[PDB]
Every structure is written in C-alpha cells, then in structure tokens.
C-alpha cells in the first residue's frame, strides 16, 4: 500500500529541515516584537492606583486570560492550516457536541495512532466537563458517566474518594472549571476586532495540545535560563545572545 510511501516522504521532508527553520521562525517572531517603544523609566505605583479598583477593572475586562494566542500578531494558525485541507481526523459525523454517550474509545484512536507522531508521554485523557446548571444543585457529572462511576464505586465500596488511584483526574477538575467560554459576557461572543478567525478549530484537540504545551511550560520553569554561560561572564544588557532565549527537548543528553 501507499501509506509507507507517504511516511517515507514525510521522513524525507522532516530530515532536511530538522531544527533550524522552526528555530528561525520563532526567533524572527521574537525579534520584531518589543521594538516599538521603550519607556525605561516608567514606574507602576500603588499610591495613585487602588487595589480594589484594579480588581473591579480586571473583573470588568473580558477575557481576563487569553484563551488562544492572537492570530494577527503571530501566524501560529498558518502552520495548522499549512497541510490540513478538510481531513476530518474525527471521521465519525461532525457536530461532536450534544451527541452523548455512544462515544466509543476507538473513534479518536484510528486516525491518531496512524499519524506516527511524538511518543505517548501524552496522557491521552480528555477531561469532559458538564456543568448541569448555573446554580449548584445537580449530580456532579453527566448521568451516563455517573452511573458507571456509581457501579465502580459500589465495587470499591465508595468509602473515601481522597485516596484515588490516579491523582490526575482529581487535579485536572480543580485546574479547569470552565468551558471554552470564560464568563459568558454579553460582549464576549460579538467581537469583530481579531482579524483572523481560527476557522472553527475543535476545542478538545486545541485544549489537549495547549495543556501538553503547558507541560512544556512547567518543565521550562528554570532558576536560571543559561546555566552553562553563567559562570564565564554574567552581566545585564538589553541584548540577547540567543534570539529564542529558551531551549526545548535535549538532543542527545
């Protein structure tokens, strides 16, 4: 079959580039920014400003936290649509929404496995969250999943939920208590000021990729950015020896 030829072409394409064009793209993106205007003397004080009014203004602004990176500022979206022409990688019927259980575990699996991707340090677990009502008087999950949870709990006697076998499920619910709409503000949805729509990208795939990039972020949290070059010469300059100013996965160490 022709899948092997396509995989060979993909390996051939990736071996040429390897690391330098992506690195150069990211560096170019960083270089253009921060060149508009530098104050160098502006100081933010707590005297003229007030913490209470700051909190109210922060609450008033929407969205408080940027759900996705702005497409107009940086062409992140171009890479996604670079070689994706419709290609329904969920090959079951679209509107993957309000379609309840009768959600088999194998319907994402078929396309994803074949992709020959990054090794599965991917948790590959989706935190489906259902907020039944705005007021909190409801069974605290969807009923179809809830009855299965009740059956497993009855097997386990449902004594203490604190000593869970896997703490990831308990933690992720605390981490994200919201759907792709942050606060349901009247003006949150009617916005026509971001001049590059995401072309209705699926929330679940974006969220999984985003949280795996947040695992990349927490591993990126280091005491010093340049451990190797710190003993030789340490100084403060508004210049960068490395344009990326960070490193990714280790090549051979």
């Amino acid at each position: 079959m022709s899948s092997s030829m396509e995989c060979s072409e993909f390996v051939g394409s990736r071996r040429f580039t390897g690391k330098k064009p992506s690195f150069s793209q990211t560096c170019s993106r960083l270089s253009q920014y921060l060149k508009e205007n530098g104050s160098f003397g502006d100081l933010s004080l707590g005297m003229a400003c007030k913490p209470d009014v700051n909190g109210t203004l922060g609450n008033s602004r929407q969205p408080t936290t940027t759900m996705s990176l702005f497409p107009c500022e940086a062409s992140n979206m171009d890479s996604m649509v670079q070689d994706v022409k419709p290609t329904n990688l969920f090959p079951r019927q679209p509107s993957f929404s309000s379609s309840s259980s009768s959600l088999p575990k194998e319907d994402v699996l078929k396309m994803t496995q074949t992709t020959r991707s990054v090794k599965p340090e991917s948790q590959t677990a989706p935190l489906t969250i259902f907020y039944a009502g705005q007021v909190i008087v409801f069974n605290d999950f969807s009923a179809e999943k809830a009855k299965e949870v009740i059956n497993l709990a009855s097997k386990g006697t449902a004594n203490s939920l604190a000593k869970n076998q896997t703490d990831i499920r308990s933690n992720i619910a605390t981490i994200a208590n919201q759907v792709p709409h942050p606060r349901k503000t009247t003006t949150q949805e009617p916005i026509q000021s971001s001049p590059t729509p995401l072309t209705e990208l699926p929330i679940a795939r974006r969220a999984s990729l985003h949280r795996f990039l947040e695992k990349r972020k927490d591993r990126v949290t280091s005491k010093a950015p340049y451990q190797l070059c710190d003993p030789a010469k340490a100084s403060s300059n508004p210049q960068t020896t490395g344009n990326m100013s960070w490193l990714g996965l280790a090549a051979e160490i």
Binding site: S44, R61, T66
Partner: protein
C-alpha cells in the same frame, strides 16, 4: 503617601547593599462584629521598586501594565516587578504571615538565601524565591512593617535596622 514614598526611597538610596524593592505594610483596624475584637490588620501602605517566562504570562503582565498606564496617563515585566505588583493585593492579620510575625513580636526577621526562603515555611517567602528573590527582611516599626527584598544574598547588617529606626517613627 507621598512623604512615605520619599522616605521609603530614601531608605534604599543610602542602603549599603543592592536592595531590589521596599514595601511599607500599614496597620489598620476593622470591627469584626462576631468576636467583638478590633483586629489589627496589615495591608499595602506604600512601596518603591528600584530593581537592577513564557508568552501567556508576559502577555497577561503587559496587559496589566498597559491597563495601569491607561489609568495613570511596552517593555517586558520581570519577576521582581510582578512580585512587587502582586504584593499590593495581599492583606495580613496581625500575627499571620511574615510581617504579622514581625509586628506582633516587634523583632527583625531576616531570611537570607533561597534555602532559608524555602525552609522558612512562609508562603510569601516561597513565592518570592520562585520569583527571583534571594533575601527578604521584615523590620517592625511603630505604625507598620518595613519589608525589603533583593535578588542578591545579603547578611544581617545592623546599619539597615539603624536606618529604618532613624527614618521612621
């Protein structure tokens, strides 16, 4: 606030070492109707920063900084600037936390080095250690607590507490 601003800036201008910031925690009294206790609470009084991440954090910080600029009237926001800014939101019951411990016992508390910071058990010192600070000092005064922070490692100088006692009542 302006006079206290001047005196907090004066405190670090004559300082022998390189202190990153200075914060005056201010006493107040709220009437808790349940216990009937006029509880003393430390809160943000004033502050003076002197000084020397990923995309989402820096965009959040730059958004906050330009919101403040819009209020008063685009460089990157270092971890010390952001710790200084987020410290304005915190309040401290007397005895609770590092400034409340300094105030309640009228003593100087000197946390020098990231080991001391992480080993002290104060959450503010830990968050400061995460955000680049190496030295945190709380000195009790008559009307509040003077807190100094620095990214360098500084050992106990009596000259600092002397300056604090001189410039403040």
């Amino acid at each position: 606030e302006d006079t206290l601003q001047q005196r907090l800036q004066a405190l670090i201008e004559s300082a022998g070492e390189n202190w990153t910031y200075a914060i005056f925690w201010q006493i107040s009294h709220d009437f808790d109707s349940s216990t009937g206790d006029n509880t003393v609470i430390l809160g943000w009084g004033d502050g003076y920063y002197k000084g020397e991440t990923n995309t989402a954090e820096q965009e959040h910080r730059k958004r906050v900084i330009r919101e403040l600029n819009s209020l008063i009237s685009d460089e990157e926001v270092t971890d010390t600037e952001w710790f200084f800014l987020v410290s304005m939101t915190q309040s401290f019951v007397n005895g609770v936390g590092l400034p409340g411990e300094s105030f309640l016992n009228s003593r100087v508390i000197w946390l020098s080095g990231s080991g001391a910071l992480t080993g002290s058990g104060c959450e503010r010192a830990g968050q400061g250690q995460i955000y680049g600070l190496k030295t945190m000092v709380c000195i009790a005064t008559q009307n509040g607590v003077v807190e100094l922070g620095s990214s360098e490692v500084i050992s106990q100088s009596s000259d600092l507490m002397h300056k604090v006692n001189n410039l403040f009542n």
